[PDB]
Amino acid sequence: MSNVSQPTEFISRHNIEGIFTFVDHRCVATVGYQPQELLGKNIVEFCHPEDQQLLRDSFQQVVKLKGQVLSVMFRFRSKNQEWLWMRTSSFTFQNPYSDEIEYIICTNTNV
């Protein structure tokens, strides 16, 4: 067992377009933003322009094959004005009763 004194990973949920609809408080340590500064914005707004097609394609693909898991490596702009390399896994979570997509779950790891 160990303390994770300075978190470098956080979970977010998104709609199929990429809008942040949930983000855990580890986002502060990881990327420097409070949840309130991310919620309602598109994750692509935080993405290095060079990596924006990659990120967009990830969101498109995860929704096509519901339940498949993808991993994407992109640069995220920190509140401290640096590009942070992120490795994000993504997948759609399906309602267990209706099987509809409820949201996309992203686990965002600064590497």
Side-chain angles (χ1 to χ4, degrees):
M1 218 195 73
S2 64
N3 290 342
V4 180
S5 310
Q6 296 181 255
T8 52
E9 175 172 290
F10 67 98
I11 295 158
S12 54
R13 306 195 295 242
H14 304 258
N15 85 328
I16 59 175
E17 301 174 297
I19 299 174
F20 281 100
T21 63
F22 171 85
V23 67
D24 80 58
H25 70 269
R26 298 175 297 167
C27 60
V28 177
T30 306
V31 292
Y33 292 103
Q34 292 290 336
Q36 311 92 262
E37 299 178 88
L38 300 178
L39 291 163
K41 299 178 168 71
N42 202 297
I43 188 167
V44 177
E45 300 174 47
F46 293 85
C47 184
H48 191 298
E50 289 191 331
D51 304 337
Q52 287 185 185
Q53 177 61 22
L54 181 67
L55 193 158
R56 281 166 189 158
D57 201 51
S58 177
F59 278 87
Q60 299 177 143
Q61 285 191 38
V62 284
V63 169
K64 285 189 160 62
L65 271 171
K66 283 160 59 178
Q68 82 161 146
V69 187
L70 304 180
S71 184
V72 66
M73 175 77 69
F74 72 102
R75 283 160 292 182
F76 192 111
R77 53 170 180 85
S78 77
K79 178 92 163 165
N80 301 112
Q81 293 172 111
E82 56 184 19
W83 293 121
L84 301 174
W85 279 106
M86 313 293 285
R87 182 189 62 232
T88 289
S89 62
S90 302
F91 62 99
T92 61
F93 174 82
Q94 281 56 254
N95 186 268
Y97 303 114
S98 69
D99 202 47
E100 295 174 0
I101 302 174
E102 286 195 27
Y103 42 76
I104 292 164
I105 299 183
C106 291
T107 306
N108 308 290
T109 309
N110 179 209
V111 295

